[PDB]
Symmetry: C3
Subunit: 374 residues, 3 copies
């Protein structure tokens, strides 16, 4: 085999991370989806969680009763503002600390006050509810999101969908330095007079990327293919004309970078005034939550309401769907090749794949843990 | 792990009985569903059987041809009153002894008279067709049904449904001594003026149950929680009023018991003039046949026709469905927790679970065999 | 059991051939389904292939890009007559030799010209496109089809359907002499005055079959039960009248034979003026492509157009479906019994099964390889 072991050695941990990285923050829902006193069940990294907002504060608990292991969310019953009672025998837990404070069906039980559901640390920023999945004290959320995502003046809006592919197919697709070819028919092209070449003739391999590995700040890789190559706007087949790219006035996706636990930052995009952020949150081994966020620097309540309107009325359908919908096929089609780990050894990479290789190495070395099941 | 082994030790056989107990009688269909010369296929304990009534007598044979292993019931063909002929090559077997008595496609075959389909002992009582699944001589049916079920004066009617959970989830749910909380919204409460607390404050653990262990009579456990506890009608959470039970003049479920191979007896229920009997017949590892029978002592053919009409016009929708429908969620929600055996070790039981523990111990020690595949 | 090992010894390879035999020709589609410049994906023996007709010539290549392993046919894109370009990063391959001749997204890539998709030898005869699946040089197509199928004067037409069963269930069912019992109610019987018995009373087991194993020509088995038995047109059950066959004046299925890699020849059928040929091409372990071809010796372009018309207007619904639709249930019902290999040991065969046994032995000894999937 190895030949293959030597080639994949530096990313063995990544190859094993079918369920994602443990001990990191992950966004799971939009703020508006988690309303006051209205529990919402979610699943991430194979773990079933139940969310709820109490007095404006979002709380997260394991979505499973400690008694007979039923799923609490199968029939949500709350009889006090701060608690949820299991629908089977009334074991009652607090949302803030998961403690079993009462048992409606037997107030004399010696089990009362002796147990607690697992709770997940929560952070709600930029219209997203983030959960920390791990066993160690959480580090700052800033270390798990792209640089600038938490900037005070950055207005953010987004949407999410479930993709039938492992989360890694999402990140591989998202940070793939030379895949613009798949977007050559996007309505966003002439819809926003954006320039989109067919591909790139890469320069020196050592110049194509830059990695950030310091402590106290997000760790990731910058894709520098753009400034170190000759954009391809026309290509031939066996010497004959075959196809052309799409030249336009606006140059976007000037700075592309990916960060642990696996979040993309495309700047500027889909317009010189916007920045796109993407997450590929693991749900289970065969699915991921593809979260697409668009941000715009705002200086007043007025230009904020303005961006909000432009987001829903234009960008969602023109870009988030009009441009990115073609990415889903890529993820679904690569899925089977990599689902059994064979792809990591059999793939035949070329020049523009240097960036993903650097991401695989960095992710393998700096992730805070490999999520596993039982 | 060692603490788990010691705790589950007395019921390890039960943990392995995913397919039920072998060498016991099991009801599979209502008498009316097995009509004269109208073969009906069934599956119990993972075994596929074909039933038919010939001259009033119900017969049961393995639902698989000895030749090429096809399922006989895929296309039932009978060319003589006493036989069934496989639809593929005409191997012909007698219903009464499973004997290969003819081969329509080759009357001179040396195989004729040299083989026989497996046959299952049958007993038809109280409108139910019972099959003995096992290799030893059948003991009396009375030993596998609750006390009184076969009383000459008991008029019986019932219905069944397939539940998406292991049979043990059905029995655990049925004999769960303190689960009335799940039935607090049943239309039966107001519908039949039945009292229903939210739970119970159990007395001495040693007084909560009584076990009966053969020989020559059904073996099972009596749930004595009602007699040794304080009914819980008012529930609180952290000192504040949370929810309340329901008052009624009719007292039901005075006596609850479960018997091997796994049948419940609730008396009286759902009315002082009735008794409910429940079976959780294993179909395969993930499904069971939930059989609900209601019995009423009758003294004349007049009050028999009366009970029959009441059963259909009132009790089926008011109780069998109106009360027990909420039980299905419980079985389905516990299913995954116990399907991989981890639930038996990870569950956190409390006081009212003494009864189910006594059942698991009794079932483990006295079952006549563990049904397996291969 | 040692008894089972000894019994199945002579056909152990056949038992392992769940995916079919490697190094043989297999028909995959009708010529009309593979049009000029209109790529069509197919799957045989677990391998995904992409077909296309360029300048009237059919080409076949592996349906998977060498780059990231996506399925090319998920979005066919051709920018030059002789090539196909992957929809993801534009790697471009020639249909005739699978060579990676260009990479639209990076014309300077060092990978260009250093790789080639696997190609499959192709043969197009009698309105069918045959593919050779193997690693060795292809032998003559004539060695993998029934005798006379390629005769110059044989006009051929047919249809195919995917069947939910392993390919062997198709061959087993096809070359089975006692199976005519399943066809006793076929509309073809009265519809064409066909004489179809219920079964047969075979003679010496030694003259029931004849094998052909010479080199240079197809290898197979001739079913000689007909010319060596007493056909059963009426049969009794326990001495009493039970069922009758279907006498007629048109004699068909006079000569039945099966040939490697697994193709049946029934002559004449479904009419004295026709010959039926059937293929059971493995798709994957649980499905096969059931190809039904009808041939008629023709001497003029007029009777050729006449047969073509009769095929469409009469034989398709009266025989291909009217007669063979019943064979499908047989294959599906046997499927589970043999899917886990238990069937080969537990089946109880009788006299007329001598023919299938001869096929299993011949197929085991002469197949050119067992197809396997890592
Ligand atoms: S399973 Fe939740 S209170 Fe019993
Ligand atoms: S499979 Fe039943 S008679 Fe042949
Ligand atoms: S996956 Fe086909 S060119 Fe990249
Ligand atoms: Fe899915
Ligand atoms: Fe993309
Ligand atoms: Fe099911
Ligand atoms: Fe209940
Ligand atoms: Fe299928
Ligand atoms: Fe047939």
């Amino acid at each position: 085999a190895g030949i293959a072991e030597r080639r994949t050695r530096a990313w063995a941990p990544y190859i094993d991370a079918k369920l994602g990285f443990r001990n990191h923050w992950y966004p799971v829902r939009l703020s508006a989806e988690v309303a006051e006193a209205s529990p919402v069940p979610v699943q991430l990294l194979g773990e079933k969680v139940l969310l709820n907002r109490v007095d404006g504060v979002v709380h997260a608990i394991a979505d499973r009763c400690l008694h007979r292991g039923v799923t609490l969310s199968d029939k949500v019953e709350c009889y006090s503002k701060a608690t949820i009672s299991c629908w089977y025998h009334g074991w009652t837990y607090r949302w803030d600390n998961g403690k079993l404070v009462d048992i409606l069906t037997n107030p004399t039980s010696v089990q009362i006050g002796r147990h607690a559901l697992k709770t997940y640390p929560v952070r709600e920023e930029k219209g997203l509810v983030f959960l920390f999945v791990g066993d160690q004290e959480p580090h700052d959320l800033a270390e798990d999101v792209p640089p600038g995502f938490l900037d005070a003046d950055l207005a953010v809006h987004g949407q999410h969908r479930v993709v039938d592919a492992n989360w890694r197919m999402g990140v591989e697709n998202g940070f793939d330095a030379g895949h613009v070819f798949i977007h050559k028919s996007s309505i966003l092209l002439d819809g926003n007079d954006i320039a989109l070449p067919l591909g790139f003739a890469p320069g020196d391999p050592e110049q194509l990327t830059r990695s950030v590995t310091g402590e106290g700040a997000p760790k990731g890789v910058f894709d520098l293919l753009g400034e170190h190559s000759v954009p391809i706007f026309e290509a031939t087949i066996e010497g004959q004309p075959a196809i052309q790219g799409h030249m336009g006035s606006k140059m976007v996706a000037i700075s592309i970078s990916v960060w642990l636990p696996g979040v993309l930052k495309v700047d500027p995009f889909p317009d010189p005034t916007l920045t796109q952020f993407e997450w590929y949150v693991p749900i289970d081994e065969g699915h991921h939550l593809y979260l697409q966020m668009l941000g715009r620097r705002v200086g007043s309540e007025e230009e904020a309401r303005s961006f909000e309107a432009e987001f829903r009325e234009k960008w969602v359908e023109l870009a988030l769907n009009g441009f990115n919908d073609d990415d889903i096929l890529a993820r679904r089609s690569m899925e089977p090749f990599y689902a059994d780990d064979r792809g990591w050894r059999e793939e035949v990479l070329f020049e523009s794949d240097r960036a993903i290789i650097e991401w695989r190495r960095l992710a393998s070395q700096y992730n805070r843990g490999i999520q596993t099941r039982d």
